[PDB]
Amino acid sequence: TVLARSIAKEGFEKISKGANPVEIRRGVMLAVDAVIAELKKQSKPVTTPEEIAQVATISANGDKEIGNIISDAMKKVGRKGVITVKDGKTL
Amino acid sequence: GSAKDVKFGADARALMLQGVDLLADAVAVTMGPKGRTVIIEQSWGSPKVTKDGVTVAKSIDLKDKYKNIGAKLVQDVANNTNEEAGDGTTTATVLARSIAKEGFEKISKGANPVEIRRGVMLAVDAVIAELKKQSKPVTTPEEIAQVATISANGDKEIGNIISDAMKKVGRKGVITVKDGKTLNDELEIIEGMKFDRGYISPYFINTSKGQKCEFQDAYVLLSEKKISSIQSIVPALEIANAHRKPLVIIAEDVDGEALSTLVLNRLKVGLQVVAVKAPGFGDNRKNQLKDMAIATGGAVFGEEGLTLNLEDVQPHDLGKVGEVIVTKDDAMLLKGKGDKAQIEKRIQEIIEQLDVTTSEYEKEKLNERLAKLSDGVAVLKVGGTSDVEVNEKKDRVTDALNATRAAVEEGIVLGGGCALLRCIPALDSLTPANEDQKIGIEIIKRTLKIPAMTIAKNAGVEGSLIVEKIMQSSSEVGYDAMAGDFVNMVEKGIIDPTKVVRTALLDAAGVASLLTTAEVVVTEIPKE
Amino acid sequence: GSAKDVKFGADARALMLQGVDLLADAVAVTMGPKGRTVIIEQSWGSPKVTKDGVTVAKSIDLKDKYKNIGAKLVQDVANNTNEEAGDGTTTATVLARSIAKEGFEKISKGANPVEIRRGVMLAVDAVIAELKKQSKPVTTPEEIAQVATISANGDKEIGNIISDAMKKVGRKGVITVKDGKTLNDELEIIEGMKFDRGYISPYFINTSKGQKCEFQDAYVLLSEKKISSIQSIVPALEIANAHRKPLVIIAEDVDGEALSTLVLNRLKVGLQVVAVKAPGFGDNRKNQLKDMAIATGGAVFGEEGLTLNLEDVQPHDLGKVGEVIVTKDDAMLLKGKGDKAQIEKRIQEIIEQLDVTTSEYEKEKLNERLAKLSDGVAVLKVGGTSDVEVNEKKDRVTDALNATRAAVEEGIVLGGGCALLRCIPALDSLTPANEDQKIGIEIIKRTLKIPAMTIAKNAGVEGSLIVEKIMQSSSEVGYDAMAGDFVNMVEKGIIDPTKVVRTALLDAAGVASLLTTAEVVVTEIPKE
Amino acid sequence: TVLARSIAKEGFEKISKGANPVEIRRGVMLAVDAVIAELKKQSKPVTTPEEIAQVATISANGDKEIGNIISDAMKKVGRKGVITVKDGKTL
C-alpha cells in the first residue's frame, strides 16, 4: 500500500500537458520487471531449519515463541506439510 | 399525462449543446496515442478503467432534462458505430459534436435547418464515395499485423498475437478472447473437437498418468437417449471385443445397469471401453451429437423419426477415431474418419442457418457447432496482475481484433485522420442547389479536420497548425502523433479500416444533422 | 368529493388562452417547408424527433389546471383531425387558436357567446361548401405523385414510391409501411396470400438456402381441427404421392403421430410434404381457411355443419397452388387456381360484412382478409442510419400516404393556404340574422388568413404582406414558400386534398367556437 | 493585455515542483530584450506626410477623415507641436 500510494503520488505530479501517462506506465513496468529481475539474482535458498525460525520470528512482529513453534511444527510435518491454526482456549 | 415543460429556440439549443459538449469532452480525451483513460464508478465493486468511447459515453447520464437529451443522442451515435464496425466510437462522438456546434450557429430566422440537413447528407455521400476510391484492399499478413497494432493503442504484442492467430486459422476463422490467468498473453489453437464433459466411472483410467482414459483407433457409439438396460448395450461391445478395438459410448447417460456392465468388463479381462454423457443441454445436443456422428462416420441411435435402435448395430454403424483423450471433466475426439466431402456440406448448412436467424442464443450455440467442427479455433488468454488491468487490455484487444476483421473485408486507408482530410478536395467541386445546402457542405468541409485536430490537441501540440501543414503536404504524408513529426503512413504503418471510418462519419452525420433541425424541446417535469 | 377551485370571467379566459397559445406555439413551428422539428423526451430511451403536429400536441401536458384545460381542448382538435383525415393537424391547431383568441376578445357584457358560435358555424358551412365547388378530381397518376411530394415535406423520392405503389395495387389498394433496415426505401409488392406462421418440423426444408421450403404445383389440404392420427392423414398423402406432386397441410395443428409419419416419409424415399398451423386465432381462422379454400379450390375439412372428413378425400377436393414458399415464421401461397368467378363472390360477401358492422377489431381482421386475397399488398420499408431518423422519416411517409388516399376519393385544391384564401369572397355575401352572428362570420373571415400567414412566417418573411399580395393576384397564383416567390400552383405542383382542408377547419371551428362560450371554470385542487 | 494573459497562462503551466519561476522570469526578460532590439533594426523613420495619414487612419479604427485631419493639424503646427481635442458641438 505504501508503494501504491508512492507511485500514485509521484504519478499525479508529472502529469503536465505534454506528458503521456501511458508511456510513463510502460516505463514503470519496465522498471518493475528489471528490479524483480534483480531480487532473484541476489536471492538465496533457505536451507537450514534456523532460517525457518528466523523468517517466522520476523513476520510475527518479532515474537520468538511463534518462531520456535512454527519451526518445530514444520520439522515434524515437512516444510510443505499441512499446518493449520485454531482459536485456542488455554493461555 | 405527466406534467411537462417546454423550451423554445436559442435557450433549448444551448442546453442540449451543453449536454453534447460535456459527453464529448469526456470521451475526446481517449483518442489516439497519448489519449488518456477514464475511470468509471461501478455501482458494486472496484471501478472500470477504459479508453473505449462507448463505455465512456453509455455511462454518462445527466441530471438536467435538456442536457440529458444531448447526451442520449450522442450515446446513440457511439452505439450505432460500435455495433456496425466495432471501433471508431470516439471518432464518431467528436464528429457529432462538431456537426452540432457548427449547426447551432447557422440557425438564424431565415435559415432552413432541414435543407441544411439535406446538404450535409449530400456532402457525406460524396465523401464516403471518395474514401472508397482512395481505399485499397488488405493483402499482406504484415498489413494485418499493422492494423491490429494501431487499434490496440500501439501495443505491438497485440498486433503479433492477432496476426499469428489469424495466419493459423484463416482471416475469417474464429478467434475468441478470455480473461487470462498468467502474466503474459497466450495463443492457444484448439485443433479438432472437444466438449466439456468427462467419463462417468473413474475405473476407465488406463493411463497411469494424470487421470486420463486414452485410446487410439477406437469405435464410437452415439446414442440420443439413455442406455438403460444390458440388452441395448451388449451388441455394441460384442463388436468392439470381436474386432479388438476400444470403444467410446457417447449417450445422454449410461444407466446404473449398463454402467455396471461396462465397469465389470473393464476391471476383469480388460475390454477397452469408456462412457460420457452428451454435450447438452436440450434441443442442442440433438444436433450436436448428429454433428459428431458425420464427423466420425456413423449414426445417432434412438433418433426421433429414424429411431436407429441399439439392439441392431453393425461395425460400420460405429464411428471411428484415430485417438481419444478423456479426463474427469472433458472429452476430446481428434481424428474422425468422417468422409470430409460430406462434413463440408454440413458446415455450409450450419452457416446458412445462422445467416437466416438470430436469437443471441440459437446463434450462440450455432457458432459453437462451426467452431467445434471446423478448422481449429484460436483462443487468447490475456495476462495481467490485477483485475481492472485485464478488463482494460481486454477492451483494447477486442477493438484491435474487430478492426482487423473489418479491414480484411473492406479495405484500408490512411490513419491519424488523414483519411478524411484527403477527401476535402472532393467537397470543393460540389455545386449546391441553393443557399441552405451550401451551408451544409461547408459544415462538413470544416468537420473533416476535427479528427486529426483532436489527436494533435491530445498530443500537446497546436491542433489546426498540424492539420494545415498536412494538407499542404503530399498525399501519403501526415502526422505521427506518438513520434511527433510527419511521416509517410503505410511505410511507417499507420492505417485504419475504411469500414470504421465511413460508418463513424455516417452515424454521426445522420444523428447530428437532425438535432440541428430542432426548434422546440419538451421534457418531463423533474418532480423529485 | 374532491376539493375544487372556481374562476370567473376574464381571468379564466386569459389562463385558458395561455394554455392554448403555448401548445400551439410549440406546433406552429412545424408548418410547411422551413418548418422545424420538435424533440420530445421519452421517459425510457432515446427521444423522438417529429414534425407531425399531434405527436407534439398529445405530449404537452401542463402543470397548471387551467392552462392544461386549454391544452387538452387543443389536443382533442388535433386528434379529431388526425383520425378523420391523417394529415393537416398543424393546420387545425393554428386555426383553433385563432378562433379562440379572436373569441376571447369579442366577449363583452352585451355580447352573446352562443350566438357567436352559431355565426361561426354558418361561416364554416359556407366555406366547406365553397371548397367542394372549387374542388376537382385527381385523374392523372402525376397528381398522385405531387400530393405525396407536398405532404411529405417535399421529399420527391417519397412521391415516386407512393405513386408507383398505387399504380401496381390500385388507388384504393393496401399500402402499409414498416421499419426498414437498409439505407434506401424499398417497394415490395406481395403477390397472393401470406400468413404469419411457419412450418412445424424443421425437416421440411428442401431449399438448402435461407431455411425455406419451396414447392411448385402443389396440392393443399385445409383442415379446421387437428390432424391427430396416422389414420386421417394417410389418404391425402396417397393422393399426393400418386399424382406425384408436393402437398401442403394447413390444419389447426399436426399432432405428433401424423407428424411422425410426415417427417418419416420426407427423410426417406422423399415424399414432398410440409405442414403449418392455421392463421388464427379463434373464430377468425374458420373464415380465413375458408377464404384460403375457395382462393385455391378445395374444401375445409371437419367443418361444423358440413364436417367434410379427412378419411374420404379426393384430388378435386384438394386445393392447387402454382408456387408454395414456407419459412420458419411465415408461409406464402401465390397462384391459387380457385375459379376466380367464385372468389369474387366471396370478396362481395366480406365487403358487405364490413359496411354492416364496426367494432374496430372485427373490421380490422375483416380488412386483413380482403387485402390478403386479391390484388396483393404493397409494403414500404424505409431507409435510414439510426432509429430516431427512421422514426422521423416514417412519420412523414405516413402523412404523405394518408394524404394521397384522402385525395383520390375527394378531390384536390390549391395549397399554401390559398385554398381557404380563395373562399373569403364567399363569406362577403352572408347576410347575418343579428349582430352576434355577424361577429362570428367576421371571426372566421380573419381566421382564414392564418395558414398562409404562418407558413411565410416560418420561412422568415412578413406573413400578412404575402397574404395580401396573394389575394390581390389572380385565382391560380400564390406563394411557394420554398422558392420564395409567387407561382401558379398546379403547374408548379402545390396541391392539397380537399378532405384534409375541410376536416381540419371543421374540427378546429367546432371545438374552438365552444370554448369561447365559457364563463366559469372549475378545477380540482392541486394537492401534491 | 492579451500579451500579459498569454504569459500568465503559459507561466502557470510550467510551474511544477522542480521548475524555478524566478529563472523563468530571467529568460522571459532575456527574450523581451532580444525582441525589442530586433524591432529597432527593422524599424524605419517616418518621413512622408502620407505615412502620418496612414498611421492616424489605422489607429483610429480606419477612419480616414480622422487621419487627414491629424495630418493637416500636424503640418500646420509642427510634428512636436501641441494638438488638443475638445467636445465639439457641430456634426
Ligand SMILES: Nc1ncnc2c1ncn2[C@@H]1O[C@H](COP(=O)(O)OP(=O)(O)O)[C@@H](O)[C@H]1O
Ligand atoms: N500512433 C498513431 N499516430 C497517429 N494517429 C493515430 C495513431 N494511432 C491511432 N491513430 C488514429 O487515431 C484515431 C483513433 O482510432 P480509434 O480506434 O477510434 O481510437 P479510439 O479507440 O481512442 O477512438 C484513428 O483514426 C487512428 O488512425
Ligand SMILES: Nc1ncnc2c1ncn2[C@@H]1O[C@H](COP(=O)(O)OP(=O)(O)O)[C@@H](O)[C@H]1O
Ligand atoms: N413547398 C411548399 N410551398 C408552399 N407551401 C407548402 C409547401 N409544402 C407544403 N406547403 C403547405 O404547408 C401546409 C402544411 O401542410 P401539412 O403537411 O398539412 O402541414 P404540416 O407542415 O403540419 O404537415 C399545407 O397547406 C401545404 O399546402
Ligand code: BEF
Ligand atoms: F473510441 Be474509438 F474511436 F472507438
Ligand code: BEF
Ligand atoms: F401537421 Be400537418 F398540418 F398535419
Ligand SMILES: [K+]
Ligand atoms: K478507445
Ligand SMILES: [K+]
Ligand atoms: K407538421
Ligand SMILES: [Mg+2]
Ligand atoms: Mg475503441
Ligand SMILES: [Mg+2]
Ligand atoms: Mg403532418
